[PDB]
Design a protein around this motif. Structure first.
Motif: not given
Lengths: 20, 20, 20
Positions: B6-15, C1-8, C12-15
């Motif tokens: 669930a965290q992997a899905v949630a976590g990519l929602a901001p992409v 760790a991967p959720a945080a990497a992706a959020q970052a 960054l991309a729109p900047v």
């Protein structure tokens, strides 16, 4: 299993919502 | 294991939200 | 760790788009 399925959907709903 | 799935899905929602 | 990497990256991309 149901807690994962409800969490995933609650975290996705705001993305969909903001296109409408 | 499902907490992590669930965290992997949630976590990519901001992409999605940054695209549209 | 991967959720945080992706959020970052999401943040960054729109900047990058403001330069070019």
């Amino acid at each position: 299993a149901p807690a994962a399925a409800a969490q995933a959907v609650a975290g996705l709903a705001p993305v969909a919502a903001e296109q409408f």
